[PDB]
Amino acid sequence: CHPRLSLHRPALEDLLLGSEANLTCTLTGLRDASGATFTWTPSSGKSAVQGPPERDLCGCYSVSSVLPGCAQPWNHGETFTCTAAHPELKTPLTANITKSGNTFRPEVHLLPPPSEELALNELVTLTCLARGFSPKDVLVRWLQGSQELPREKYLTWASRQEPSQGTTTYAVTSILRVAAEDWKKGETFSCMVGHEALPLAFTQKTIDRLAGKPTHINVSVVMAEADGTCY
Amino acid sequence: CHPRLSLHRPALEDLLLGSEANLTCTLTGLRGATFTWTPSSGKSAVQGPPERDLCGCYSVSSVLPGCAQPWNHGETFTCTAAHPELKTPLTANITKSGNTFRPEVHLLPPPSEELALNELVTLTCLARGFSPKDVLVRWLQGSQELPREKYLTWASRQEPSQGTTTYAVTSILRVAAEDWKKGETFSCMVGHEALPLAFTQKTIDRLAGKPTHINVSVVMA
Amino acid sequence: CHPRLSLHRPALEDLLLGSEANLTCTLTGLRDASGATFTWTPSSGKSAVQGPPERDLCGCYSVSSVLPGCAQPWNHGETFTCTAAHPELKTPLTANITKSGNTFRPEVHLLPPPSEELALNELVTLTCLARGFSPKDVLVRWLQGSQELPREKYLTWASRQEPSQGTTTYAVTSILRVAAEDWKKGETFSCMVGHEALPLAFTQKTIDRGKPTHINVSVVM
Ligand SMILES: *[C@@H]1O[C@H](CO)[C@@H](O[C@@H]2O[C@H](CO)[C@@H](O[C@@H]3O[C@H](CO)[C@@H](O)[C@H](O)[C@@H]3O)[C@H](O)[C@H]2NC(C)=O)[C@H](O)[C@H]1NC(C)=O
Ligand SMILES: *[C@@H]1O[C@H](CO)[C@@H](O[C@@H]2O[C@H](CO)[C@@H](O)[C@H](O)[C@H]2NC(C)=O)[C@H](O)[C@H]1NC(C)=O
């Protein structure tokens, strides 16, 4: 089973909430091991470490490396190249990666509970859909009141490509199941979405009991001195 | 590589729509073989060919037909194999699972900040709390079924509770605003093992995204 | 005044509920010579299985025989042919049965309760109407919430032929009585119809306490 090589974009959580930028490069298909080297056309500070190999399907040797300190050329839009040189290979390889232009930003929505889950009076669910963004990386975090809930209380699917209406775009969903006492008190829950193309990399939306399928809409308008020598 | 066999349950859409159901026990190994099945029922198994992938070995398979009525009634199957390249030939088994639960389906009306753009509106189906992870999701427009290349459904993950183990799945459909205004109607069907009539349906239109009573008060004082 | 034969169609109930299918060819006419014979065209799994000499009309007793497992050729388009030769009239006479064509899908409506009925606060009444379908074969089922209701709480008529322009279509109705306490509470109800021409074999319709919107606008001086 012949060798192959691939490059990987830096992780999303390490660019929005993180300071360091671990960029990596790997190599699969090897026989047992080697004494490989790696190359990167930017090298001013090349502290490239490798780490030990790992085993693959039916036994196969995979090896990789990493490169730190990469956030500013990534966001400015520089370029990076990788190549391998090891005994069980004839000629070196080649792969590059670049920060993707031609992007879009998500349209976040937050939906109220259905009407039938309000009568069973145990738990209710809140859906958070993000839609139509060009690179496929995204985050979702929930807040309760104004404090963040722990990650083990909700369920987030993966990003998938949606049917075509022009450019190719993606989508993702999530649900939170919350106690039906706090809904009828009047607490508020919020949903945050983090994407590469948004202005400050985060946005949020908020819902409570009095906003959404409310069966009730009051408004009072008071206009005080309507005939009153307006200058 | 390693010699290894599996079995597979019959697929769900063939147990639900079109009654010809199959059953499969494969084999993965050798860098000629025959298989035996324990309930005969006469119309015994065909054996087709060895495709090869996963940087391992060429792998042979086998298929037994006609497994609707014994599978639903609870009959355990076991398909044991035979090869030269094994030490003593392998064996596995499969059953129909019990202690199941059924899902509850929700169709959610579109959000209000989307009707203002006049492009397309989006509908959202949700199914929650069912014990085996097999499910089907089909959309409609009135009575006409829609082709599968028009919408998007996700996988079925596991939802984080404490009592039992349950699962969930979502799906979205985007229709045109001119047809939404006109009064047309759309549905989201869900098929599962545990339902007594194999399907359930929910329905929506441009009404019921309207509130029940409005109170406006203008005070000129 | 003829010792007769019969040929029929498979029953819609278990054709839709999945687990089997059948066909039936009976021989009537007398409680006499029992050289009852039958012969079918294919051999789908097993051949014919014959029962008792059944008691029938005032001395014209009858027999029957039934071919199992005819689901997939029926839904594919087989054109079956019965034959039978008994000695008390030694003519083997044949009859043809095939799956029909030019089907039409029904449309289902569920109508809310009248206003005089709800003011008495005794019970309510729902009504499920099905209209405009080409083969004369239907099923009705009433749910509640998500659980099925038993088949004795409600009533359904037969199926008649509506007169219209050229095209022959049919219609059925059925009604359900319900206490006013749970209709006042909010527990929902549903109606299901099963038909040969529907793509997923069923359609559902729910109802729940279609009320219009109120607009109160007030000006104060
Ligand atoms: C970054 O790496 C990519 C490889 O992923 C480089 O793109 C490759 O460019 C070469 C020539 O510049 C392409 O080869 C030629 O393609 C034409 C297509 O018609 C073919 O006729 C020729 O015979 C020859 O094969 C190659 O296809 C292309 N690869 C891909 C995936 O597009 C790219 O140049 C690199 N850029 C930098 C700045 O390093
Ligand atoms: C049917 O399959 C089950 C597994 O699905 C087999 O039972 C297990 O066998 C392994 C290895 O022998 C044991 O470690 C487990 O303790 C067994 N039990 C369970 C619950 O996993 C079983 O042997 C098979 N054959 C039968 C029932 O005839």
Side-chain angles (χ1 to χ4, degrees), chain A residues 1-3 5-12 14-19 21-29 33 35-45 47-53 55 57-59 62-69 71-75 77 79-87 91-180 182-231, chain B residues 1-19 21-30 32-50 55-56 59-66 68-72 74-84 88-148 151-161 163-177 179-209 211-221, chain C residues 1-3 5-12 14-19 21-29 33 35-45 47-53 58-59 62-69 71-77 79-87 91-121 123-150 152-164 166-180 182-183 186 188-208 210-221:
Chain A
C1 174
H2 54 281
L5 174 136
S6 64
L7 208 46
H8 281 331
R9 62 142 299 159
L12 190 58
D14 305 332
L15 276 173
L16 303 190
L17 308 172
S19 299
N22 279 13
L23 200 155
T24 182
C25 193
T26 185
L27 177 60
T28 187
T37 188
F38 289 104
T39 311
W40 277 281
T41 43
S43 315
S44 316
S47 297
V49 76
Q50 300 188 331
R55 291 307 274 172
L57 305 98
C58 283
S62 298
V63 81
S64 174
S65 158
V66 77
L67 160 59
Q72 300 326 291
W74 180 262
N75 295 344
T79 326
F80 292 90
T81 54
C82 190
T83 184
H86 89 100
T91 177
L93 279 304
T94 297
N96 43 33
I97 212 168
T98 318
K99 175 179 192 171
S100 297
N102 194 41
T103 64
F104 298 98
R105 71 174 183 259
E107 281 286 283
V108 191
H109 305 285
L110 185 41
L111 304 163
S115 87
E116 298 294 324
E117 273 188 350
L118 285 170
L120 269 73
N121 215 311
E122 301 104 338
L123 290 174
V124 289
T125 180
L126 322 177
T127 310
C128 191
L129 162 81
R131 202 212 57 91
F133 45 90
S134 168
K136 74 162 176 185
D137 327 327
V138 79
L139 312 182
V140 173
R141 306 278 184 270
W142 288 80
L143 311 191
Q144 176 211 353
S146 165
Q147 201 193 312
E148 177 193 20
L149 293 158
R151 202 195 35 97
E152 287 85 34
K153 299 209 171 312
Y154 48 82
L155 174 51
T156 302
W157 287 267
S159 299
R160 298 212 165 168
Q161 159 179 352
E162 55 174 2
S164 69
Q165 288 282 138
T167 316
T168 74
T169 53
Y170 293 89
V172 71
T173 46
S174 298
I175 48 165
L176 179 74
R177 293 217 92 207
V178 80
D182 308 345
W183 194 251
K184 278 180 183 176
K185 287 181 191 175
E187 288 208 348
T188 77
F189 311 97
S190 176
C191 192
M192 311 200 55
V193 168
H195 198 265
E196 192 184 8
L198 276 158
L200 305 169
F202 272 95
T203 199
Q204 77 187 305
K205 286 218 166 296
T206 320
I207 197 168
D208 72 272
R209 164 195 49 91
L210 202 58
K213 302 300 139 284
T215 71
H216 269 272
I217 166 172
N218 301 16
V219 61
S220 48
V221 187
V222 177
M223 198 167 62
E225 44 263 13
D227 41 353
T229 319
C230 178
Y231 56 78
Chain B
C1 190
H2 192 273
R4 173 182 305 273
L5 88 167
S6 296
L7 271 76
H8 290 303
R9 47 152 307 143
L12 186 59
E13 59 269 65
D14 303 335
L15 274 162
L16 286 181
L17 275 79
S19 295
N22 296 161
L23 198 148
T24 311
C25 42
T26 67
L27 182 59
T28 49
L30 193 87
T34 56
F35 311 93
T36 54
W37 285 258
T38 48
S40 176
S41 194
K43 278 302 184 189
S44 191
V46 81
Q47 171 154 16
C55 282
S59 67
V60 69
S61 309
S62 178
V63 159
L64 154 71
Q69 181 176 350
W71 166 265
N72 271 325
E75 197 79 21
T76 303
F77 297 82
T78 171
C79 169
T80 175
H83 206 49
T88 174
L90 306 154
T91 297
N93 42 348
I94 197 169
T95 56
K96 186 209 67 69
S97 60
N99 45 76
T100 65
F101 306 110
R102 81 159 59 89
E104 306 98 18
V105 188
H106 301 305
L107 197 41
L108 313 173
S112 296
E113 57 267 10
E114 199 178 12
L115 286 159
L117 292 204
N118 270 6
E119 322 166 349
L120 301 158
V121 301
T122 178
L123 313 179
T124 302
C125 204
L126 172 67
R128 213 207 43 85
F130 47 88
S131 182
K133 54 171 286 166
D134 310 290
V135 80
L136 306 170
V137 173
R138 308 294 179 88
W139 290 84
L140 279 84
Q141 181 176 327
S143 296
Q144 266 287 107
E145 214 192 13
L146 257 69
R148 291 219 314 187
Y151 45 89
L152 167 62
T153 71
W154 276 267
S156 71
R157 314 297 197 84
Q158 188 198 147
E159 43 178 6
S161 179
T164 61
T165 289
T166 39
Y167 295 83
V169 59
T170 49
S171 174
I172 53 164
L173 177 76
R174 311 202 74 220
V175 305
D179 292 26
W180 179 252
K181 284 310 176 306
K182 205 159 64 183
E184 295 186 353
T185 318
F186 297 89
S187 296
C188 176
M189 295 193 90
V190 164
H192 194 258
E193 307 186 349
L195 288 156
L197 278 171
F199 278 102
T200 178
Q201 203 178 357
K202 297 294 178 152
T203 312
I204 212 166
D205 48 343
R206 63 147 269 156
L207 308 178
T212 57
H213 60 85
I214 315 162
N215 279 321
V216 194
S217 176
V218 182
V219 173
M220 289 205 55
Chain C
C1 38
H2 284 140
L5 82 161
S6 160
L7 207 45
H8 284 325
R9 86 174 300 283
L12 188 51
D14 287 331
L15 183 65
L16 283 183
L17 268 301
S19 46
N22 267 324
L23 203 42
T24 303
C25 205
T26 80
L27 265 288
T28 183
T37 58
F38 300 95
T39 292
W40 305 87
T41 286
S43 175
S44 284
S47 293
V49 166
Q50 188 163 354
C58 297
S62 312
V63 299
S64 184
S65 197
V66 48
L67 174 134
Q72 289 299 284
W74 182 265
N75 297 120
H76 276 96
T79 54
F80 300 91
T81 53
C82 196
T83 190
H86 89 294
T91 302
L93 187 59
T94 49
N96 283 296
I97 289 296
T98 184
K99 152 152 195 165
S100 307
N102 49 71
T103 59
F104 267 76
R105 305 186 295 233
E107 280 88 26
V108 195
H109 305 300
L110 201 57
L111 311 173
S115 296
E116 309 91 328
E117 180 155 13
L118 194 146
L120 297 199
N121 297 95
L123 302 161
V124 301
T125 297
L126 311 160
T127 301
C128 208
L129 155 78
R131 213 212 50 86
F133 46 91
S134 295
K136 195 259 293 177
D137 277 287
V138 279
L139 289 165
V140 296
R141 293 285 189 273
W142 288 85
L143 296 202
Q144 175 177 347
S146 179
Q147 316 263 317
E148 203 175 340
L149 293 188
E152 310 95 9
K153 297 189 165 201
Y154 45 84
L155 155 72
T156 310
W157 284 258
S159 161
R160 319 294 159 94
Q161 168 178 304
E162 53 198 51
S164 188
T167 302
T168 301
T169 50
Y170 293 83
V172 196
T173 61
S174 183
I175 46 182
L176 178 78
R177 307 278 306 184
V178 153
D182 35 343
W183 171 256
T188 59
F189 301 95
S190 300
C191 186
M192 291 191 80
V193 170
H195 188 248
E196 187 178 3
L198 288 163
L200 290 152
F202 281 99
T203 322
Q204 210 166 58
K205 277 267 182 39
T206 83
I207 203 162
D208 178 61
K211 177 156 197 51
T213 180
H214 301 295
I215 297 161
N216 297 16
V217 48
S218 73
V219 181
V220 167
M221 319 294 270

mmCIF file of all heavy atoms in Angstrom, chain C residues 99-124, unseen atoms left out:
data_model
loop_
_atom_site.group_PDB
_atom_site.id
_atom_site.type_symbol
_atom_site.label_atom_id
_atom_site.label_comp_id
_atom_site.label_asym_id
_atom_site.label_seq_id
_atom_site.Cartn_x
_atom_site.Cartn_y
_atom_site.Cartn_z
ATOM 1 N N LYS C 99 -53.029 -6.746 -11.497
ATOM 2 C CA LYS C 99 -53.041 -5.485 -10.769
ATOM 3 C C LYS C 99 -53.508 -4.364 -11.686
ATOM 4 O O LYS C 99 -53.045 -4.246 -12.824
ATOM 5 C CB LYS C 99 -51.653 -5.174 -10.211
ATOM 6 C CG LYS C 99 -51.353 -3.691 -10.043
ATOM 7 C CD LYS C 99 -50.366 -3.428 -8.935
ATOM 8 C CE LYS C 99 -50.367 -1.959 -8.554
ATOM 9 N NZ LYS C 99 -49.694 -1.725 -7.244
ATOM 10 N N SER C 100 -54.431 -3.546 -11.184
ATOM 11 C CA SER C 100 -55.060 -2.493 -11.964
ATOM 12 C C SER C 100 -54.069 -1.385 -12.313
ATOM 13 O O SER C 100 -52.958 -1.312 -11.789
ATOM 14 C CB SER C 100 -56.232 -1.907 -11.188
ATOM 15 O OG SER C 100 -57.107 -2.934 -10.770
ATOM 16 N N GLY C 101 -54.490 -0.517 -13.224
ATOM 17 C CA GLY C 101 -53.707 0.649 -13.577
ATOM 18 C C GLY C 101 -54.511 1.921 -13.430
ATOM 19 O O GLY C 101 -55.613 1.875 -12.873
ATOM 20 N N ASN C 102 -53.987 3.023 -13.984
ATOM 21 C CA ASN C 102 -54.529 4.398 -13.949
ATOM 22 C C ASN C 102 -55.120 4.776 -12.586
ATOM 23 O O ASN C 102 -56.286 5.142 -12.445
ATOM 24 C CB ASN C 102 -55.524 4.660 -15.095
ATOM 25 C CG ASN C 102 -56.587 3.588 -15.245
ATOM 26 O OD1 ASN C 102 -57.484 3.459 -14.416
ATOM 27 N ND2 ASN C 102 -56.472 2.792 -16.298
ATOM 28 N N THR C 103 -54.263 4.695 -11.579
ATOM 29 C CA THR C 103 -54.617 4.965 -10.200
ATOM 30 C C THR C 103 -54.711 6.463 -9.934
ATOM 31 O O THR C 103 -54.114 7.281 -10.632
ATOM 32 C CB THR C 103 -53.579 4.350 -9.274
ATOM 33 O OG1 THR C 103 -52.295 4.902 -9.581
ATOM 34 C CG2 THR C 103 -53.525 2.857 -9.455
ATOM 35 N N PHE C 104 -55.458 6.815 -8.886
ATOM 36 C CA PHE C 104 -55.563 8.189 -8.415
ATOM 37 C C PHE C 104 -55.459 8.211 -6.897
ATOM 38 O O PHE C 104 -56.032 7.353 -6.223
ATOM 39 C CB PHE C 104 -56.883 8.822 -8.837
ATOM 40 C CG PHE C 104 -56.812 9.583 -10.123
ATOM 41 C CD1 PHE C 104 -56.766 8.918 -11.337
ATOM 42 C CD2 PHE C 104 -56.820 10.966 -10.123
ATOM 43 C CE1 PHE C 104 -56.709 9.616 -12.518
ATOM 44 C CE2 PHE C 104 -56.764 11.671 -11.302
ATOM 45 C CZ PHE C 104 -56.708 10.994 -12.501
ATOM 46 N N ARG C 105 -54.744 9.208 -6.358
ATOM 47 C CA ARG C 105 -54.518 9.362 -4.924
ATOM 48 C C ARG C 105 -55.689 10.072 -4.256
ATOM 49 O O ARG C 105 -56.217 11.042 -4.802
ATOM 50 C CB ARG C 105 -53.257 10.159 -4.658
ATOM 51 C CG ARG C 105 -52.041 9.610 -5.301
ATOM 52 C CD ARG C 105 -50.853 10.393 -4.859
ATOM 53 N NE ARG C 105 -50.955 11.760 -5.335
ATOM 54 C CZ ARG C 105 -50.005 12.377 -6.022
ATOM 55 N NH1 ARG C 105 -48.879 11.743 -6.305
ATOM 56 N NH2 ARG C 105 -50.182 13.627 -6.422
ATOM 57 N N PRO C 106 -56.087 9.630 -3.069
ATOM 58 C CA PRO C 106 -57.172 10.296 -2.350
ATOM 59 C C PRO C 106 -56.721 11.612 -1.745
ATOM 60 O O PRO C 106 -55.533 11.910 -1.632
ATOM 61 C CB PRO C 106 -57.539 9.303 -1.252
ATOM 62 C CG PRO C 106 -56.890 8.054 -1.606
ATOM 63 C CD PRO C 106 -55.709 8.367 -2.429
ATOM 64 N N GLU C 107 -57.712 12.405 -1.339
ATOM 65 C CA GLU C 107 -57.497 13.609 -0.548
ATOM 66 C C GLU C 107 -58.338 13.518 0.710
ATOM 67 O O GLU C 107 -59.514 13.152 0.646
ATOM 68 C CB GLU C 107 -57.854 14.863 -1.324
ATOM 69 C CG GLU C 107 -56.788 15.296 -2.277
ATOM 70 C CD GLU C 107 -56.950 14.643 -3.615
ATOM 71 O OE1 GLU C 107 -58.094 14.286 -3.945
ATOM 72 O OE2 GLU C 107 -55.941 14.478 -4.331
ATOM 73 N N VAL C 108 -57.741 13.847 1.846
ATOM 74 C CA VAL C 108 -58.342 13.604 3.147
ATOM 75 C C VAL C 108 -58.580 14.944 3.820
ATOM 76 O O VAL C 108 -57.745 15.846 3.722
ATOM 77 C CB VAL C 108 -57.445 12.706 4.022
ATOM 78 C CG1 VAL C 108 -58.219 12.173 5.197
ATOM 79 C CG2 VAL C 108 -56.861 11.567 3.214
ATOM 80 N N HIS C 109 -59.721 15.075 4.495
ATOM 81 C CA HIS C 109 -60.079 16.281 5.223
ATOM 82 C C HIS C 109 -60.604 15.918 6.601
ATOM 83 O O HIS C 109 -61.363 14.961 6.748
ATOM 84 C CB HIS C 109 -61.130 17.080 4.471
ATOM 85 C CG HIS C 109 -60.736 17.421 3.071
ATOM 86 N ND1 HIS C 109 -59.617 18.165 2.776
ATOM 87 C CD2 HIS C 109 -61.307 17.112 1.886
ATOM 88 C CE1 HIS C 109 -59.518 18.304 1.467
ATOM 89 N NE2 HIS C 109 -60.532 17.676 0.904
ATOM 90 N N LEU C 110 -60.202 16.685 7.604
ATOM 91 C CA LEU C 110 -60.673 16.519 8.971
ATOM 92 C C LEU C 110 -61.340 17.813 9.413
ATOM 93 O O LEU C 110 -60.717 18.876 9.386
ATOM 94 C CB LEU C 110 -59.524 16.159 9.906
ATOM 95 C CG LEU C 110 -59.901 15.476 11.217
ATOM 96 C CD1 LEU C 110 -60.673 14.236 10.949
ATOM 97 C CD2 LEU C 110 -58.681 15.134 12.018
ATOM 98 N N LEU C 111 -62.589 17.722 9.823
ATOM 99 C CA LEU C 111 -63.427 18.881 10.057
ATOM 100 C C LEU C 111 -63.652 19.115 11.542
ATOM 101 O O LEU C 111 -63.942 18.168 12.276
ATOM 102 C CB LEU C 111 -64.772 18.698 9.362
ATOM 103 C CG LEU C 111 -64.586 18.266 7.917
ATOM 104 C CD1 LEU C 111 -65.904 17.920 7.291
ATOM 105 C CD2 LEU C 111 -63.909 19.372 7.149
ATOM 106 N N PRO C 112 -63.552 20.356 12.005
ATOM 107 C CA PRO C 112 -63.537 20.621 13.439
ATOM 108 C C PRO C 112 -64.930 20.536 14.025
ATOM 109 O O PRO C 112 -65.923 20.562 13.287
ATOM 110 C CB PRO C 112 -62.990 22.054 13.522
ATOM 111 C CG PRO C 112 -62.656 22.450 12.121
ATOM 112 C CD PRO C 112 -63.464 21.600 11.235
ATOM 113 N N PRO C 113 -65.054 20.428 15.351
ATOM 114 C CA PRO C 113 -66.387 20.535 15.928
ATOM 115 C C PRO C 113 -66.777 21.990 16.083
ATOM 116 O O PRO C 113 -66.927 22.677 15.077
ATOM 117 C CB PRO C 113 -66.244 19.874 17.297
ATOM 118 C CG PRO C 113 -64.906 19.256 17.309
ATOM 119 C CD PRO C 113 -64.074 20.049 16.370
ATOM 120 N N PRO C 114 -69.671 20.815 15.473
ATOM 121 C CA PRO C 114 -70.143 22.176 15.225
ATOM 122 C C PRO C 114 -70.245 22.978 16.515
ATOM 123 O O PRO C 114 -69.988 22.442 17.589
ATOM 124 C CB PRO C 114 -71.497 21.945 14.583
ATOM 125 C CG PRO C 114 -71.290 20.703 13.838
ATOM 126 C CD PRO C 114 -70.459 19.834 14.719
ATOM 127 N N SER C 115 -70.622 24.252 16.402
ATOM 128 C CA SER C 115 -70.562 25.140 17.557
ATOM 129 C C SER C 115 -71.724 24.898 18.507
ATOM 130 O O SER C 115 -71.618 25.165 19.709
ATOM 131 C CB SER C 115 -70.532 26.588 17.090
ATOM 132 O OG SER C 115 -69.357 26.835 16.343
ATOM 133 N N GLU C 116 -72.844 24.393 17.988
ATOM 134 C CA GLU C 116 -73.952 24.007 18.853
ATOM 135 C C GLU C 116 -73.583 22.801 19.701
ATOM 136 O O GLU C 116 -74.075 22.644 20.824
ATOM 137 C CB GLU C 116 -75.194 23.694 18.020
ATOM 138 C CG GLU C 116 -75.592 24.750 16.998
ATOM 139 C CD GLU C 116 -74.976 24.533 15.631
ATOM 140 O OE1 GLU C 116 -73.850 24.003 15.563
ATOM 141 O OE2 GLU C 116 -75.619 24.900 14.626
ATOM 142 N N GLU C 117 -72.717 21.937 19.172
ATOM 143 C CA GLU C 117 -72.314 20.739 19.894
ATOM 144 C C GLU C 117 -71.408 21.081 21.070
ATOM 145 O O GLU C 117 -71.510 20.467 22.137
ATOM 146 C CB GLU C 117 -71.621 19.776 18.933
ATOM 147 C CG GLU C 117 -71.154 18.480 19.558
ATOM 148 C CD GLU C 117 -71.055 17.359 18.556
ATOM 149 O OE1 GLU C 117 -71.108 17.644 17.344
ATOM 150 O OE2 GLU C 117 -70.929 16.191 18.979
ATOM 151 N N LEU C 118 -70.530 22.072 20.906
ATOM 152 C CA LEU C 118 -69.572 22.366 21.966
ATOM 153 C C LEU C 118 -70.224 23.153 23.096
ATOM 154 O O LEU C 118 -69.741 23.136 24.233
ATOM 155 C CB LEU C 118 -68.370 23.115 21.388
ATOM 156 C CG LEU C 118 -67.079 23.257 22.208
ATOM 157 C CD1 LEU C 118 -65.884 23.236 21.282
ATOM 158 C CD2 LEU C 118 -67.031 24.532 23.043
ATOM 159 N N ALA C 119 -71.332 23.838 22.808
ATOM 160 C CA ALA C 119 -71.987 24.642 23.837
ATOM 161 C C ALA C 119 -72.743 23.770 24.831
ATOM 162 O O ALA C 119 -72.992 24.187 25.965
ATOM 163 C CB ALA C 119 -72.931 25.654 23.194
ATOM 164 N N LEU C 120 -73.120 22.560 24.427
ATOM 165 C CA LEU C 120 -73.860 21.675 25.315
ATOM 166 C C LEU C 120 -72.935 21.033 26.338
ATOM 167 O O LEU C 120 -73.399 20.563 27.381
ATOM 168 C CB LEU C 120 -74.586 20.594 24.516
ATOM 169 C CG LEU C 120 -75.662 21.017 23.520
ATOM 170 C CD1 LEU C 120 -76.554 19.831 23.204
ATOM 171 C CD2 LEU C 120 -76.488 22.164 24.054
ATOM 172 N N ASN C 121 -71.636 21.003 26.021
ATOM 173 C CA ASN C 121 -70.570 20.468 26.880
ATOM 174 C C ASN C 121 -70.807 19.011 27.268
ATOM 175 O O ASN C 121 -70.483 18.592 28.381
ATOM 176 C CB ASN C 121 -70.366 21.337 28.122
ATOM 177 C CG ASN C 121 -69.907 22.732 27.776
ATOM 178 O OD1 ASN C 121 -70.710 23.656 27.670
ATOM 179 N ND2 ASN C 121 -68.605 22.893 27.594
ATOM 180 N N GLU C 122 -71.367 18.226 26.348
ATOM 181 C CA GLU C 122 -71.557 16.797 26.563
ATOM 182 C C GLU C 122 -70.468 15.973 25.883
ATOM 183 O O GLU C 122 -69.726 15.246 26.548
ATOM 184 C CB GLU C 122 -72.946 16.381 26.063
ATOM 185 N N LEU C 123 -70.355 16.082 24.561
ATOM 186 C CA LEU C 123 -69.300 15.441 23.788
ATOM 187 C C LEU C 123 -68.988 16.349 22.605
ATOM 188 O O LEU C 123 -69.561 17.431 22.465
ATOM 189 C CB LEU C 123 -69.713 14.045 23.300
ATOM 190 C CG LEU C 123 -70.147 12.904 24.230
ATOM 191 C CD1 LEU C 123 -70.924 11.844 23.464
ATOM 192 C CD2 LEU C 123 -68.960 12.278 24.929
ATOM 193 N N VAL C 124 -68.067 15.914 21.746
ATOM 194 C CA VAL C 124 -67.804 16.610 20.486
ATOM 195 C C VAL C 124 -67.865 15.592 19.355
ATOM 196 O O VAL C 124 -68.249 14.442 19.574
ATOM 197 C CB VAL C 124 -66.457 17.357 20.495
ATOM 198 C CG1 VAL C 124 -66.395 18.384 21.609
ATOM 199 C CG2 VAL C 124 -65.323 16.393 20.636
#
